[PDB]
Amino acid sequence: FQGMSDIELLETLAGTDQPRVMATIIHVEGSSYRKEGAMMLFQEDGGCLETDLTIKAQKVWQEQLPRTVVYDLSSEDDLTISVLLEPVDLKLRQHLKRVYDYLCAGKSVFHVKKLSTSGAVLEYAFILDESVYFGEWHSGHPVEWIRKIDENEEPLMFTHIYSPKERLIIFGAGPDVPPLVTFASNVGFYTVVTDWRPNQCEKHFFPDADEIIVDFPADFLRKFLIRPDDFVLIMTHHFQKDQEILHFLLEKELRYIGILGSKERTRRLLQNRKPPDHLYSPVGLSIDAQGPEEIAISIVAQLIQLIRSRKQASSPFSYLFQP
Amino acid sequence: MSDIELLETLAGTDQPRVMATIIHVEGSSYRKEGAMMLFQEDGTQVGLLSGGCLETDLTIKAQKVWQEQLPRTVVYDLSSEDDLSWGQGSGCNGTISVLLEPVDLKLRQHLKRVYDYLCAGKSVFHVKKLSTSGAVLEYAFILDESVYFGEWHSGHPVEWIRKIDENEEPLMFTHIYSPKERLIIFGAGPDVPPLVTFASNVGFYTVVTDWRPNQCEKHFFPDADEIIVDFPADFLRKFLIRPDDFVLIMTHHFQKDQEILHFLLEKELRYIGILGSKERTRRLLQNRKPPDHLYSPVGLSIDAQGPEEIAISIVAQLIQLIRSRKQASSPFSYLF
Amino acid sequence: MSDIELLETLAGTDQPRVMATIIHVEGSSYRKEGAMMLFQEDGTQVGLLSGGCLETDLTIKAQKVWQEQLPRTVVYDLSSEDDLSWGQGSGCNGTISVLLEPVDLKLRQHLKRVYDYLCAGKSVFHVKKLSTSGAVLEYAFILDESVYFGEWHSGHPVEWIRKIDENEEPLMFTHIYSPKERLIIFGAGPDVPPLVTFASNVGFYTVVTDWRPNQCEKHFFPDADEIIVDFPADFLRKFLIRPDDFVLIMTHHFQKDQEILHFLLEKELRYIGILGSKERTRRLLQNRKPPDHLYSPVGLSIDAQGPEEIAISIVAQLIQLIRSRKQASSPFSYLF
Amino acid sequence: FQGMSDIELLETLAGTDQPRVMATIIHVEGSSYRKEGAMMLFQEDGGCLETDLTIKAQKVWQEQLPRTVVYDLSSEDDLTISVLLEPVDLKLRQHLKRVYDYLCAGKSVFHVKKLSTSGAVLEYAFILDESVYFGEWHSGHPVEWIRKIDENEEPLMFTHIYSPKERLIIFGAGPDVPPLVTFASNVGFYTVVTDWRPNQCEKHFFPDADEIIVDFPADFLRKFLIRPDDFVLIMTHHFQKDQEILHFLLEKELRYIGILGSKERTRRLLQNRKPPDHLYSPVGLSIDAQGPEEIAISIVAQLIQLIRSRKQASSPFSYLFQP
Ligand SMILES: [Cl-]
Ligand SMILES: [Cl-]
Ligand SMILES: [Cl-]
Ligand SMILES: [Cl-]
């Protein structure tokens, strides 16, 4: 189940065309290691629950009809959850391919399932804006249907946000940067490494980096577009270079700016300028880390903390529920 | 990298090498006092001390040290680094003292002996006696008050250290070479491989144990030092867990987690981390005195989701405790 | 690489650069006096002067020259190179004087103007007036006795040069920036692409002409500066061949080779090479006075077989003649 | 015709299984740009001669019978030669695959064709030793048949030596070595680059090098086998390194040892030792070359001169004709 990213799962559907049934935990009552929203793909070709689901998935594909299966998780071995099995038909295959393309573009997608009392999927939509949506939704504006759900008489609704690959833009390719690229890549970040020294940027130093761009910071910032939902990490160990990068990103709306060094050094970098809103110096959690490997953990832990802490503020689509 | 990995590198390629050691730090610096780095003839460097334009100057100094076959102390004002860059320098408001030593046939042999003792699990106390000019007069590798090796001609190196100026005479440098910290992981589920990778990369000796042989294939855990396929009860009987070890219980099986925890209860341990909720771990303890260093929920609370994030959270917690815990817990404390 | 390719590199990436020039050589050295090299901030170097551990020291000197924004002369005893290596040094029994100049906004602008004149086909006479300390007092780029540019404040740079000590006062350095030598190739058969590559790599401006459009596709000659599809008679009417040009006749068509040769007969030319035997070329001349610089069979006699080997043979012959031919054939000879 | 190497041509037969007819110039009378022994492959899917051969090749494949075609080359446009057309049948395909494998191993192969008066191929063999041969040879020892050929009454014989890729082992990966690798590779050498500095040995510096081995000279010489028919080029610009390489190769039987530098420097390298037999210092022809690009031409020209000058001594199989 919960071991593969949403974008890593939708990617699997693109390089397939193979018969597949998708499982989703739409409800959890009590204790479970797997959370609500966790997904899994059954391909028509480990654990007692997954083996029963395999048989159910096989039936769901043949019937070409979704079903909700309830499992009384109650056992002193840790083996009540509600699993939704949907056949990835030509319609849903097409819609999920469109979802993947929007996450590749960096845009999040709000998904909503309208379920029947029996547990069948009546309607489903993929929302981008207050008007822009796609899917098998025949009844009104999906957004207006969600806001107008009844307190107790309307719990036959499932929502999930398909979040794109988070980007981590790293300024510097020194020998302390390869562990950070590895840890950030493994956790699920899209990593961009940029430095002006071509010998520092050989691909064998950063095999997990999605992009390695050899350029002076000023050229990079001119050519490469930095999105406001991106994470910037300045660790060149060159004052003038760090100052060149920071001064450019100053008025730019940015989620995170982390600078490797002391508060005094960052104060010196900002000489004669107003600091940006989401500046983190010293970078990473204070775990008194020593060396590149430990500092890299400290940085990635902080990123995870901020992605998950600001995910309690419902940041991508919270604006579609106020007014 | 790690002391044992740096000393491992000397056993390999056998080529001219100069060893750089930060013997003193004043102010702010990327690395702390005791940090090492290898300057090699092949133009490669093993480790970093600044990450700036400092390494560029040391390379030239290292080349001179090898030719002269004479150690040297180089002092770097990292703030006034404009006298080393194409730009405004590093910017770090600190001054570091780097000691460059040629890894000659004598020191090569001594460091190979240090490595063999760390492979055996024995720590080594290293001491250097420096001259006023900054060269190395004497050096020793201590195992006990009487047992020592190296290039030490005067008296008992141990008695020379205890009878020093005060909080170290500036002409003395000490460093303890210790073996890797051990991380004993109970469970081989698909959430354990990222934890093994992150813990291995940060410098832990990793032991993975589970009773299910197909979850324990070596390709799942290529960074694990040991993969032992056994029932927890057999593992605990056969494999000795020392008090300085780190235990991580993540089998996702209540009865299994309960036999592991109940065994380790009275055993003095550095760390016990159990994957799950405080309520689950209360049920696991089933009215027992909790161990002194029990961590449930495991890892720092960064609201981690998925195996990859939980693994970062745990390694973060492990780093925090190794670095927070009183540095006056050395294996050569008994000596002083 | 070539002067025009080195000056081309300054027009691009626009980053801190220090220019190294060999202003004097005593004894044996890999490069001759006038050889240049670029030290860049990105850690890349454009050209070489020794290829040893010299470049490693210059990099540090270049970094200082940029910071100080002041030129410097560095003298290297290449024999006593043990004071620069991990080993016994270079071994070359020579002493070189390297002049390091920061490519400041002023010099960047002047060198961009030099490049534009070489693109136009006009050579540029460069002169540096050095101080006793080895710094640069003045420098100029001469086009004619009166027309000059740069950072020259005293008199007429031309009159300053002619009125020097004798065979140059040690405080004077001169260098002629000339455009690429032209190699005009008649024929686009499958034996011509290796010759275009080897001639292009060595520094020739290559022009390929043939009357058969499918042999002249650009993918066959990616290194050719010009590919002109025309009958030889039309090419010779339209394209001007200067006396300092190099001609290579290799159409494998007797009548075509004969119209090309008969046209170039009275025309003063640096070089005319015809692919084939002396007998064939005797038949081509059909009782005519052979040109002064006719080479048939073409290339050095190394008993070459196939297009690739014949191409080496021809480029070898071309190099031999450019280097053998009297150096007192400069375009600024008329000035002195 | 003569534009593709023998080994480059036999390679083409391995990645084929496609119907193919091989042409060979078995005789030349007078003037021709193409020499005797030149080969070409016609595949059953530029110039007037090649177009006629294409039609003849098509007939030869259908008939599955070799034929000799004579072309009166006499024309004042340069358009008498004897072309042999042989269908690359399953038998010959198999034999030529074996020839290729021996050239990959570095062993030369002596080929002989026994032709009829009509121009058909009666017999053919591929000789390695005084006893070791393979092919479609039914009559005696091919070697003894060749030595005992009649002065004038036996010219119905064609011989050709299939020579392996010549190896050029370059010690040094400085910025002067990439043009030499390119020129040597283009002319047809198997190039091996070795240096002890990994940053000097990135593959993008030497894309034409067959092997790039990062090692100290002493380790290279221990691990990599140097054949007596190999060409060694010492150009590390490091005296101690060049001395380490030369001292090892001293008693070793070697075709060519070229050292970049002066005779005095090479004399200093050989301090207290007898120089090897095929030492070339200064390396390359004296064309007063300046810079890496010109020196590289000078070196490759010398190599070509020595391969072709010692090819007049019939070096690979001259020993099978003396005694
Ligand atoms: Cl900088
Ligand atoms: Cl309890
Ligand atoms: Cl050396
Ligand atoms: Cl004549």
- In this structure, what are the phi and psi dihedrals at residue D171, rounded to the nearest 5 degrees? -95, 105
Whether residue B86 and residue C60 make contact (CB cut-off 8 A), yes or no, is no
Give the separation between CA B75 and CA B97, rounded to whole angstroms.
Answer: 4
Distance from CA of C66 to the nearest CA of A (A): 15
D317/D107 Cα distance (integer angstroms): 11
Distance (Å, whole) CA B326 – CA A82? 48
Burial of residue C263 (number of CB atoms within 10 Å: 0-12, 13-18, 19+): middle
Q: Provide the residue count of chain A.
A: 323
Q: Are residues D110 and D61 in the same domain?
A: yes
Length of chain B: 336
Query: Contact, D252 vs D232, CB < 8 A?
Result: no
Which chain B residue lies closest to D214 (C-alpha atoms)? Answer: B42
- Same domain? For D172 and D131 the reply is no
Q: Where are the extended beta strands (E) located within C178-249?
A: 181-186, 204-210, 226-229, 246-249
CA atoms of C104 and C151, how far apart (whole Å):
12
Domain boundary among A110, A137, A166: A166
The reply to whether C130 and C236 lie within a common domain is: no
Strand order in the sheet with D157-162: D133-136, D121-127, D109-115, D157-162
Q: Rounded to an integer, what distance in angstroms lies between the CA atom of residue C66 and that of residue C49? A: 19
- Cβ separation of B198 and A179 shorter than 8 Å? no
Q: Half-sphere exposure of residue C253, counting CA atoms within 13 Å on the CB side?
A: 15
- The residue whose two tokens read 């009782």 is C287
Contact D29, D51 (CB under 8 A): no
Q: Do C16 and B60 touch (CB under 8 A)?
A: no
Beta strand pairing status for B94-102 and B17-27?
antiparallel
Q: Find all residues with CB under 8 Å of A129, minimum gap 6, and list them.
A: none
Query: What is the C-alpha separation between A71 and A85, in angstroms, rounded?
Result: 13
| Residue ending a domain, choose from B134, B153, B181 | B181
* Element at B326 (helix H, strand E): none
Please tell me whether residues D317 and D272 are part of one structural domain. Answer: yes
Q: Are B187 and B232 in contact (CB under 8 A)?
A: no
CA of D303: which chain C residue's CA is closest? C302
Q: Are B94 and B30 in contact (CB under 8 A)?
A: no
Phi, psi at B228, each rounded to 5° = -115, 115
- What are the φ and ψ backbone dihedral angles of B92, each rounded to 5 degrees? -65, 125
Q: Which residues of B touch C57 (CB under 8 A)?
A: 60
Q: How far apart are CA A246 and CA D251, in angstroms?
A: 63
CATH number of the domain at D320, please: 3.40.50.720
Nearest to D256 by CA among D297, D290, D300, D291: D300
Nearest to C51 among D2, D175, D298 (CB): D175
C163 and C91 in a single domain? The answer is yes
Which residues, listed in sequence order, are joined to residue C25 by a DSSP beta bridge? C96
d(CA C166, CA D35): 58
Q: How far is C89 from chain D (nearest CA, A)?
A: 6
Cα–Cα distance measured from residue B272 to residue B293, given in angstroms and rounded to the nearest whole number = 6
Last residue of a domain, one of A166, A187, A212: A166
Q: The domain containing residue B234 runs over which residues?
A: 182-336
Instruction: Give Cβ neighbours of residue C24 (< 8 Å, ≥ 6 apart).
Output: C33, C96, C97, C170
Alpha carbon distance B28, B90 (integer Å): 11
- Identify the three-state secondary structure at position A82: strand
CA distance D185 to A5: 47
Asked whether residue B195 falls in the same domain as residue B259, the answer is: yes
Q: What DSSP character marks residue C43?
A: S
The rounded Å distance from CA B287 to ligand 2 centre is 3
Q: How many degrees, rounded to 5, is the angle at CA C238 between CA C232 and CA C239? A: 80
Angstrom CA distances, D235 to A232, D85, D193, stand at 45, 46, 11
Q: Which chains touch B (3 or more CB pairs under 8 A)?
A: A, C, D
Distance of CA C193 to the CA centre of its chain: 21
The separation between CA D299 and the C-alpha centre of its own chain, rounded to angstroms, equals 17
Contacts of C317 in chain D (CB under 8 A): 287
Nearest to B319 by CA among B204, B209, B239: B204
Within a 10 A sphere around the Cβ of C11, how many other Cβ atoms? 12
The three-class DSSP label of residue D251 is: coil
Give D 182-211 residues with CB within 8 A of chain B: 196-200
CA dist B211 and B218 (Å) reads 14
Token reading at D163:
């020579």
Same-domain status, D171 and D102: no
Exp. method? X-ray
DSSP H helical segments within chain C, as ranges? 3-11, 54-68, 105-120, 157-162, 192-202, 232-238, 254-264, 278-285, 307-324
Q: If DSSP codes are grouped into helix, strand and coil, which group holds residue B115? A: helix
Which of C13, C40, C42, C45 to mutate against chain A (most A CBs within 10 Å)? C42
Q: In which element (H, E) is residue B98 found? A: strand B94-102
Show the tokens assigned to A228.
């406001």
Compute the distance between CA of residue C38 and CA of residue D175 in angstroms, rounded to an integer.
Answer: 13
Task: Residue D293: name the closest of C223, C59, C102 by CA.
Answer: C223
What are the start-end ranges of the H helices in chain B?
A: 3-11, 54-68, 105-120, 157-162, 192-202, 232-238, 254-264, 278-285, 307-324
Q: What is the DSSP letter of C82?
A: G
Å from CA of A239 to ligand 1 middle: 6
Residues 6+ apart with CB under 8 A from B90: A237, A238, A239, B50, B52, B53, B54, B78, B79, B81, B84
Residue D59 sits in the same domain as residue D173 = no
Q: Distance (Å, rounded) from C-alpha A165 to C-alpha A10? A: 12
C-alpha dist (Å) from residue B172 to B100, B157, B162, C289, C326:
15, 11, 11, 90, 68
What letters, b where the CB count within 10 A reaches 16 and e where it falls short, cover B190-207? ebbbbbbbbbbbbbbbbb
Whether residues A114 and A204 share a domain: the answer is no
**Euclidean distance between CA atoms C2 and B190, whole angstroms:** 59
| β-bridge partners, B138 | B129
**DSSP 8-state assignment for residue A163:** P
SS3 content of chain B, % helix, strand, coil (to 5): 30, 25, 45
B287 CB-contact burial (10 Å; exposed 0-12 / middle 13-18 / buried 19+): exposed
Q: Answer whether A290 sits within 8 Å of B201, measured CB to CB.
A: no
Based on the domain organization, do C148 and C221 belong to the same domain? no
- Tell me the C-alpha distance between B127 and B129, whole Å: 7
Q: How many domains does chain A have?
A: 2
Q: How far is it, in rounded angstroms, from Cα C317 to Cα C296?
A: 12
* Residue-wise DSSP of B3-60: HHHHHHHHHSS---EEEEEEEEEEE--SS-TT-EEEEETTS-EES-SSSSSHHHHHHH
Neighbours of chain A (3+ CB pairs under 8 A): B, C
Residue whose structure tokens are 């015709």: D1
**Contact at 8 Å (CB) between A10 and A142?**
no
In order of B3, D27, D43, D183, the CA distances from B114 in angstroms are 10, 75, 68, 50
Q: Which residue, among D87, D90, D94, D45, has the nearest Cα to D63 in the 3D structure?
A: D87
Which chain D residues have a beta carbon less than 8 Å from that of C300? 285, 287, 301, 305
User: Cα-flanking dihedrals φ and ψ of residue C302, to 5°?
Assistant: -120, 15
Residue B289: CB atoms within 10 A of its CB come to 8
Report the length, in residues, of chain C.
Answer: 336
Residue of B nearest to A76 (CA): B254
The answer to whether C67 faces chain A, any CB pair under 8 Å, is no
Mutation target vs B (from C67, C69, C90; most B CBs, 10 A cutoff): C67
Do residues B42 and B166 share a domain?
yes
Residue B193's SS3 state is helix
Question: How far does C234 lie from chain D, in Å, by closest CA?
Answer: 20
CA distances in angstroms from A41 to A38, A53, A76, B273, C130, listed in the order given: 11, 10, 27, 31, 76
3-state secondary structure of A213: strand
Resolution in angstroms comes to 2.8
Measured from the Cβ of residue A205, the count of other Cβ atoms closer than 10 Å reads: 17
Backbone φ and ψ of B188, nearest 5°: -130, 35
Question: Going by C-beta distance under 8 Å and a sequence separation of 6 or more, which residues neighbour residue B84?
Answer: B52, B53, B54, B56, B57, B90, C63
Query: Which of B:295-324 have CB within 8 Å of A?
Result: 300, 302-309, 312-313, 315-317, 319-320, 323-324
| Minimum Cα–Cα distance from B87: chain C residue | C67
DSSP A91-127: HHHHHHHHHHHHHHTT--EEEEEEE-TTS-EEEEEEE
Residue ranges of E strands in chain A? 20-28, 39-43, 67-71, 81-87, 109-115, 121-127, 133-136, 157-162, 166-171, 189-195, 211-214, 231-234, 256-259, 279-280
Which chain D residues are closer than 8 Å to B44 by Cβ?
A: 198-199
Residue in B253, B277, B316 closest to A298 by CB: B316
CA angle, corner B160, sides to B154 and B161, nearest 5? 140
Smallest CA–CA distance, residue A222 to chain C, in Å, is: 14
Contacts of C255 (CB under 8 A, 6+ apart): D76, D77
Same domain membership, residue D263 and residue D309? yes
User: D111: which DSSP letter?
Assistant: E
Terminal alpha carbon distance of chain D: 36
Strand order in the sheet with C181-186: C226-229, C204-210, C181-186, C246-249, C271-274, C294-295
Q: Could you tell me the CA-to-CA distances from B224 to A115, A296, A314, A319 in Å, in that order?
A: 45, 20, 39, 46
Quick one: which H or E segment has residue B182? strand B181-186
- Residues near C287 by Cβ (< 8 Å), separated by ≥ 6? none
Encoded amino acid at D116, one letter = S
**Is the peptide bond between A316 and the residue preceding it cis, with omega within 30 degrees of 0?**
no
Contacts of A46 (CB under 8 A, 6+ apart): B215
